[PDB]
A paper describes a structure:
The active site of βPGM is located in a cleft formed between the cap domain (T16–V87) and the core domain (M1–D15, S88–K221), and these domains reorient in response to the binding of a phosphodianion group in the distal region of the active site30. Substrate-free βPGM exists as two distinct conformers with different activities due to cis-trans isomerisation of the K145-P146 peptide bond on the multi-second timescale.
Two monomers are present in the asymmetric unit, each of which overlays closely with the cis-P βPGMD10N:βG16BP complex (PDB 5OK129) (chain A: non-H atom RMSD = 1.3 Å, chain B: non-H atom RMSD = 1.3 Å) and their corresponding interdomain hinge closure angle and Euler angles are consistent with a NAC III conformation. Chain A is slightly more closed than chain B. In each active site, βG16BP is coordinated by the substrate specificity loop with the 1-phosphate group aligned and in van der Waals contact with the carboxylate nucleophile of D8, while the 6-phosphate group is coordinated by R49 in the distal region of the active site. The K145-A146 peptide bond is in the trans conformation and the sidechain of K145 is in a solvent exposed position. A water molecule occupies the vacated alkylammonium cation site, and MgT is coordinated between this water molecule and Mgcat. However, despite the slightly more open interdomain hinge closure angle in chain B, the conformation of the allomorphic control loop allows the formation of a hitherto unobserved interdomain hydrogen bond with the substrate specificity loop (K145NH–G46CO). These loops are too distant for direct interdomain hydrogen bonding in chain A. The observation of MgT in the same site within the trans-A βPGMD10N,P146A:βG16BP:MgT complex, the trans-P βPGMD10N:F16BP:MgT complex and the trans-A βPGMD10N,P146A:F16BP:MgT complex indicates that its accommodation is correlated with a trans K145-X146 peptide bond.
Residue numbers in the entry:
A (entry chain A), B (entry chain B): 1 to 221
């Protein structure tokens, strides 16, 4: 059986996309960039902080010094962190708490494989820390948006190979990253967005242990 | 007693999966899409031609016009049709010819409920057409994945309700389709693929009239 589930954070466990967006938008407007709208923001979902800033600078044909780049990312992060102070257990997505309980009861490892360096604080705000066996640290691994390294690290952090794991993602690039890791992806979202080459569910209420096991068994030949 | 048996084609009466696979892989290579391997191909079984092409495009997040999509499906089908020109009566799966004889002699209706538009040609190549009371036409009803409509149409084409029928399938989604139609499914293959809540035989040599009768009786209580 799969020995671990590797969880995305934003779009799976909860979603703080609106606050990421608002913080990026506010930063962009401050530095004279006006194109950071919700459509553009779709290109930032799932993407590292630094690659997100780079996409925003690129949009505006803007270039800044290394020092200024760090300052800008920090400014956005400080605003984001202010905005997520009131995240609570009520923000856990539908079905997720029960899934975590069931995985734990079945001694299946639970690892966070989020791009977000704010993951630990968010899990604490949601009272989920006790379920997580490990959190892969995005500062420690390759962080391009389709890079498999965060998923590989999450599996390894709980003593298992990606080949022995399921990964849950909302991002197209994250699904590709899971494939490249060797883990089995199960996406959450619409076919129009994620495609049909992997198993997807419409929303997290469909992520049950029974469903994960059914998919796993079918996919292991 | 049941009044009809609704037969899948590929994986039940014969299997042309290898030729479907080779034709899709050739098409994918022409358009520069990687990932159409034998493992991926498992998810194309019981899927319509168009839904199969969509999955392949989705491997690469490729988008095409409606005309381009039609052209690609046509090119794959042309290649597939060439590759099945040598199908013969020796390709009929084990036990199937005797089952057809026994059903006919017991005045049980026989209908094809395949997703494949190439079904009639294949039955002719195998010298089986005369055993079939009807062929449900997957160009005229929904027939991909878990669509019950192809099974409903097959039953109706021989004057019976699905509730009066057994359906035979090798695909998990096709088993679901049979269940949703109201017919009694009997799968062939792995429980790991098809489920633990229907009768499954390991291979088609187990599909005998006596066995179908025993299952029908057992499932009526
Ligand atoms: O390090 P941080 O600035 O907190 O977040 C990094 C990224 O985390 C991602 O989380 P996920 O991969 O969806 O869980 C978000 O989707 C993305 O919008 C964000 O830029
Ligand atoms: O219309 P065509 O391109 O000839 O075939 C459509 C589909 O027929 C299905 O037949 P079945 O449902 O297993 O008998 C095959 O399993 C599937 O792989 C194929 O794509
Ligand atoms: Mg996400
Ligand atoms: Mg992610
Ligand atoms: Mg609140
Ligand atoms: Mg089949
Ligand atoms: Mg079928
Ligand atoms: Mg031959
Ligand atoms: Na923990």
């Amino acid at each position: 059986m799969f020995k671990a589930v590797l969880f995305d954070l934003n779009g799976v466990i909860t979603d703080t996309a609106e606050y990421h967006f608002r913080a990026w938008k506010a930063l962009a407007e401050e530095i004279g960039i006006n194109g950071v709208d919700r459509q553009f923001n779709e290109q930032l979902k799932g993407v590292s902080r630094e690659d997100s800033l780079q996409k925003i600078l690129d949009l505006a044909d803007k270039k800044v010094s290394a020092e200024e780049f760090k300052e800008l990312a920090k400014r956005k992060n400080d605003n984001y962190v202010k905005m997520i102070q009131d995240v609570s257990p009520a923000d856990v997505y539908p079905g997720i708490l029960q899934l975590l309980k069931d995985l734990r009861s079945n001694k299946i490892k639970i690892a966070l494989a989020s791009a977000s360096k704010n993951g630990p604080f968010l899990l604490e705000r949601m009272n989920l820390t006790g379920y997580f066996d490990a959190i892969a640290d995005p500062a420690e691994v390759a962080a391009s948006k389709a890079a498999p390294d965060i998923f590989i690290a999450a599996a390894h952090a709980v003593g298992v190979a990606p080949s022995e794991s399921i990964g849950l993602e909302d991002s197209q690039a994250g699904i590709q990253a899971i494939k490249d890791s060797g883990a089995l992806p199960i996406g959450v979202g619409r076919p129009e967005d994620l495609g049909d080459d992997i198993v997807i569910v419409p929303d997290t209420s469909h992520y049950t242990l029974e469903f994960l096991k059914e998919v796993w068994l079918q996919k292991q030949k």
